[PDB]
Design a protein around this ligand. Structure first.
Ligand SMILES: COc1ccc2c(c1)c(CC(=O)O)c(C)n2C(=O)c1ccc(Cl)cc1
Length: 121
């Protein structure tokens, strides 16, 4: 679920998901279109594609369980949808952590009109 994902993001990065990752670039949050602005935004593009692999799952609301094995995220067994949603969220949180060094506040609240075009998953 979005609330869990926000907690996983905060745990990984030390940034609050809202507002650091909820309106960032072209894909973090509302998403849709354009060339991702930077590595962090690319994390969000891939996460959007990951959710898109799961058209009959409901990632905003479906809760999954995960644990920490020392710092590593281990998705625990739930339903198929929950397992897959967890792996998508885990990857995004790790991606955000791996790209904190280039995270840029100038991309927060990035305007939709600067995000134009395709980019297939
Ligand atoms: C490839 O682009 C997508 C497609 C679907 C998406 C998202 C991004 C994000 C992006 C996000 O919030 O990070 C969410 C939440 N999607 C869904 O929830 C969703 C839910 C139910 C169905 Cl049936 C289909 C899709």
């Amino acid at each position: 679920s979005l609330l869990e994902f926000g907690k996983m993001i905060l745990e990984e990065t030390g940034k609050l998901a809202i507002p650091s990752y909820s309106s960032y670039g072209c894909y973090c949050g509302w998403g849709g279109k354009g060339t991702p602005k930077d590595a962090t935004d690319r994390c969000c593009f891939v996460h959007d594609c990951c959710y898109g692999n799961l058209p009959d799952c409901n990632p905003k609301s479906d809760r999954y369980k995960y644990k920490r094995v020392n710092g590593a995220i281990v998705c625990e067994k739930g339903t198929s949808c929950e397992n897959r949603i967890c792996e998508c969220d885990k990857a995004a949180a790790i991606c955000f952590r791996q790209n904190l060094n280039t995270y840029s506040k100038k991309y927060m609240l990035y305007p939709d009109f600067l995000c134009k075009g395709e980019l297939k998953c």
